[PDB]
Design a binder for this molecule. Structure first.
Ligand SMILES: C[C@H](CO)OC[C@@H](C)OC[C@@H](C)OC[C@@H](C)OC[C@@H](C)OC[C@H](C)OC[C@@H](C)O
Ligand SMILES: C[C@H](CO)OC[C@@H](C)OC[C@@H](C)OC[C@@H](C)OC[C@@H](C)OC[C@H](C)OC[C@@H](C)O
Ligand SMILES: C[C@H](CO)OC[C@@H](C)OC[C@@H](C)OC[C@@H](C)OC[C@@H](C)OC[C@H](C)OC[C@@H](C)O
Ligand SMILES: C[C@H](CO)OC[C@@H](C)OC[C@@H](C)OC[C@@H](C)OC[C@@H](C)OC[C@H](C)OC[C@@H](C)O
Ligand SMILES: CCCCCCCCO[C@@H]1O[C@H](CO)[C@@H](O)[C@H](O)[C@H]1O
Ligand SMILES: [Cl-]
Ligand SMILES: [Cl-]
Length: 656
């Protein structure tokens, strides 16, 4: 049977073949891995993919490219930019390399697809309660109930509140509710209805000065004392008691499926979703012109505070039709996947008055101040993108051993954008009032439309060398809206060994991007392992070696491995280790800021104890050696996020 650590099939019907028979570098992170590791969010889940992390500012990076706009939920773009909890996730599908034929407007470096939980054919209840470091509390509930011969419901509930063990005042609070019903299970006609609501209320973290890090230099001769005063206390909060981050997600999904016959299925999915967010966060600046020296003693010196504010609403409405069909023409088998997608996305950024923040003491920051919140001023920016997309995939079974595949996708989009600024101010990009226009009036500065076409295509071939091993090649030609062109070549090999419960892959890749700014190249090597070495022994991890020629936020070496062993009927033990290579900032870094970050190791451990079939406990320890490191650094180079210290998570799991 399948390993819980190596799901055999993508959930997306655009993938007609099992992962091991797919000519792409594709890692699936199962629900069981997420649970065993205590992963509460997408970023945590992604520790199982080497090199993928939120190294910037915080945004997730893959192969040197921001991936924030290449996150999907059930194959539909995730709108807005909020952290994603794992409570409603069945698995996470990560493609390393292009996926424009599958999603159109995605990063040619990789995509991430979170697969939502659906009603199952069995009845059961799981619940979890957790306590952890820094007042961490979390509760989850997952109820599945079969309600007739062909109907099932599922409900997932989550609540979490925590402070931050490494950071004063930073905190996160959220809850989520995700009810579903499915009709017609086990028949030719199925209807899935999904809803999801999440609310978050957080204190955001702008990070801390980079003084004293490797590569840091004071920005002037007159501030040379900062070459000797040392790293600031990594627990220091440089924001204010007014900083906050609020968001809500509301998503409704309706999926109809009709089997035309045993080998042909048509699907229609409608989703409406809205993500609202507003925040006030403190960004600190440490250039010569940002530093105040009330006396010559550095204990009195300050850096300037900048308010990073946002008040935004994103909406999407999309309808997607997919058709899959398997049939022969002569001796050639066909696996077809084709469809059409209609989408409207909108975004409103609500204008707010400028917020002014007092300077912050470098070594003794005073965050007790209450500058106040945001006030809308009615000068808004509004955007709309309408997209029509059509695609076709086919895998040709030429012989038992040889398969050819290909896909093509066409996107046509229309984008409208308008923006108004309240005139007469001075902060940020202020505007002088036109003649006769009273101060503070919103003045339209942009009002434009645009249209464009994207073509994406890919072709691959795969040869089964043995019953267990194959070799494959894949080629993809991508393009995004500014048209950014990307070509990718890939050759790899995939092996299912140890009763086919363990998947081993290796791939070489080369990607060339033009019109990103000139041409870039990223090439390298990827190895991965997932599944069961023995019935008691589960592993998942990988290794990446890569080089990103320019012509940033990309480790050239990265490793991760998680290993779990069922030591007795009641005792299991797990441990993980990940290496993040050093990274370099070629551009944008201010004078004297670190031009590089050092590589580091992080280790994690787990102990599980089963009391009976209804109750088991789990202890997770994160950053077991309490290692000090730079988790990320912003583009300016003035501020960074320190790696979290050692933390603990203790969970009671109940099953009924
Ligand atoms: C399915 C249906 C369809 O409509 O929706 C029902 C669902 C939407 O209801 C869930 C929601 C109404 O529950 C709100 C509750 C979870 O929040 C409590 C929280 C605000 O207190 C913490 C508080 C600020 O902080 C504590 C301290 C700081 O004072
Ligand atoms: C779990 C519990 C029991 O424990 O049972 C849950 C179940 C009784 O709740 C019902 C829920 C699952 O319904 C989903 C609802 C949100 O459907 C959206 C539909 C209207 O689609 C509109 C479509 C996308 O968009 C329309 C367009 C205008 O945007
Ligand atoms: C107690 C916990 C549980 O481990 O942690 C202890 C930890 C401290 O030591 C873990 C270490 C012993 O694990 C080694 C293993 C995870 O490496 C597998 C990798 C080399 O892939 C080879 C590949 C699958 O091999 C193919 C197969 C045919 O042999
Ligand atoms: C008893 C507890 C709980 O199981 O284990 C404590 C401790 C032994 O765990 C160490 C942890 C770091 O292992 C990570 C694991 C995934 O193994 C990966 C492999 C790289 O380790 C070989 C090894 C560390 O490297 C040797 C050398 C190359 O540095
Ligand atoms: C089952 C795993 C048990 C291993 C426990 C060893 C923890 C090693 O962690 C140790 O913590 C010390 C105090 O924080 C630090 O000073 C050491 O540098 C670090 O090695
Ligand atoms: Cl996240
Ligand atoms: Cl592609």
């Amino acid at each position: 049977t399948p390993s819980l650590y190596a799901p055999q099939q993508s959930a997306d019907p655009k993938f007609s073949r099992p992962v091991a028979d797919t000519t792409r570098t594709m890692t699936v992170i199962s629900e069981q891995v997420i649970k065993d590791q205590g992963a509460t969010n997408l970023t945590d889940a992604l520790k199982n993919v080497p090199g993928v992390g939120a190294f910037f500012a915080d945004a997730i990076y893959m192969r040197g490219a921001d991936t924030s706009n290449s996150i999907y939920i059930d194959g539909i773009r995730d709108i807005g930019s909020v952290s994603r909890d794992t409570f409603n996730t069945e698995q996470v599908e990560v493609i390393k390399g292009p996926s424009g034929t599958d999603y159109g407007r995605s990063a040619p470096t990789g995509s991430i697809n979170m697969i939502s939980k659906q009603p199952r054919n069995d009845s059961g209840i799981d619940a979890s309660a957790s306590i952890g470091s820094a007042w961490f509390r979390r509760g989850t509930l997952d109820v599945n109930q079969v309600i007739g011969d062909t109907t099932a419901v599922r409900l997932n509930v989550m609540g979490e509140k925590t402070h931050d063990a490494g950071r004063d005042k930073v905190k996160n609070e959220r809850y989520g509710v995700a009810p579903s019903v499915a009709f017609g299970l086990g028949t030719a006609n199925r209807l899935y209805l999904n809803y999801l609501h999440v609310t978050q209320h957080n204190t955001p973290d702008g990070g801390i000065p980079t003084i004293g890090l490797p590569g840091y230099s004071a920005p002037s001769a007159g501030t040379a004392a900062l070459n000797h005063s040392g790293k600031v206390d990594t627990h220091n909060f440089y924001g204010t008691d007014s900083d906050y981050d609020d968001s809500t997600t509301d998503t409704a999904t309706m999926r109809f499926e009709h089997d035309i016959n045993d080998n042909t299925t048509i699907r229609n999915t409608t989703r409406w979703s809205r993500v609202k967010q507003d925040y006030l966060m403190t960004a600190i600046m440490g250039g010569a012109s940002n530093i105040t020296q009330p006396t010559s003693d550095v204990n009195s010196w300050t850096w300037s505070r900048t308010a990073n504010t946002k008040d935004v609403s994103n909406k999407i409405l999309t309808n997607q039709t997919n058709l899959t069909s398997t049939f022969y023409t002569g001796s050639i088998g066909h696996d077809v996947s084709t469809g059409v997608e209609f989408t409207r996305e909108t975004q409103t950024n609500y204008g707010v008055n400028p917020v002014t923040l007092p300077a912050v003491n470098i070594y003794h920051p005073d965050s007790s101040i209450h500058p106040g919140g945001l006030t809308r001023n009615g000068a808004n920016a509004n955007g709309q993108t309408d997209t029509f997309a059509i695609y076709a995939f086919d895998t040709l079974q030429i012989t038992r051993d040889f398969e050819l595949n290909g896909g093509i996708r066409l996107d046509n989009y229309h984008t409208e954008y308008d923006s108004a600024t309240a005139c007469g101010g001075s902060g940020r990009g202020a505007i002088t009032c036109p003649t006769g226009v009273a101060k503070g009036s919103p003045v339209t500065t942009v009002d434009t439309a645009k249209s464009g076409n994207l073509m994406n295509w890919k072709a691959g071939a795969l040869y089964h060398l043995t019953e267990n091993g194959n070799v494959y090649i894949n080629y993809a030609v991508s393009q995004q809206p500014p048209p950014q062109k990307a070509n990718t070549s890939e050759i790899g090999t995939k092996w299912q060994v140890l009763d086919k419960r363990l998947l081993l892959t290796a791939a070489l890749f080369r990607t060339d991007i033009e019109n990103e700014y000139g041409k870039k190249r990223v090439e390298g090597y990827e190895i991965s392992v997932a599944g069961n070495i023995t019935p008691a022994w589960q592993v998942i991890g990988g290794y990446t070696q890569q080089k990103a020629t320019i012509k940033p936020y990309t480790p050239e070496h990265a490793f991760t491995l998680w290993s779990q062993y069922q030591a007795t009927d009641d005792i299991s033990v797990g441990a993980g280790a990940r290496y993040i290579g050093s990274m370099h900032k070629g551009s944008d870094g201010a004078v004297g800021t670190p031009a590089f970050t050092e590589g580091y190791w992080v280790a994690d451990a787990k102990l599980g104890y089963r009391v009976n079939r209804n109750l088991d406990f789990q202890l997770n320890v994160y950053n077991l050696f309490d290692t000090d490191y730079v988790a990320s650094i912003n583009k300016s180079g003035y501020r960074y996020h320190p790696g979290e210290p050692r933390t603990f998570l203790l969970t009671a799991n109940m099953h009924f």
